[PDB]
Design a binder for this molecule. Sequence first.
Ligand SMILES: *[C@@H](O)[C@H](CCCC)NC(=O)[C@H](CC(C)C)NC(=O)OCc1ccccc1
Length: 220
Amino acid sequence: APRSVDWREKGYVTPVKNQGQCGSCWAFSATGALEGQMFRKTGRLISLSEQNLVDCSGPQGNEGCNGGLMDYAFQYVQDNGGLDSEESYPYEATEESCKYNPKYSVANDAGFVDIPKQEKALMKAVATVGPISVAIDAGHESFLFYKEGIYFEPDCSSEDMDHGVLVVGYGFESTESDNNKYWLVKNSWGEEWGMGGYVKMAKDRRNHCGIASAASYPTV
Ligand SMILES: *[C@@H](O)[C@H](CCCC)NC(=O)[C@H](CC(C)C)NC(=O)OCc1ccccc1
């Protein structure tokens, strides 16, 4: 595989969004992956409605601001036959009744693909598919205060993940400890968090924070 990948340079990635104080990270991860695969198909990048997912994908297993899973969001888009644009169905950071309108649907999917639970498989997927939805253990103060560099949290769990994010690439940079590889990860906490809203998370360090444990993408 390549040593470095960044799908933002290829037009696959919308700006960083802000989920607010609603536990809807799974919806932002899912819209990010679907924005990438829709762009791969149509050559058009269109921001998608997380609120549509929060309000409407309960039947697939999601629980609004109380959490959810990207694969359940991809299943909703398939079952529902569409997903509204961000513009048409803007984000309100609280769960309400479903207001999906098919006339404003701008995306579709035909299911999803789950990646084997190995960083080598995640790397192949990021290199060939586009941005990938992943789950990580983000439950540490070090993740709140991240500014730059490669994020490594010795207490991070590889099995207990609590936050969905989007891997848009990977790369390397020289470091003191010579653990130099990272996943380039788009978060949904606004652009004031991290490096313009992104974090470089340790790569090939025993599946740090579980980044390869629940990785998937929608089939478009
Ligand atoms: C991220 O904002 C939220 C915060 C949840 C607490 C309010 N995290 C999730 O949604 C998390 C993401 C996965 C690890 C990818 N999932 C979650 O909390 O799921 C709970 C749940 C599981 C299955 C079905 C419904 C709810």
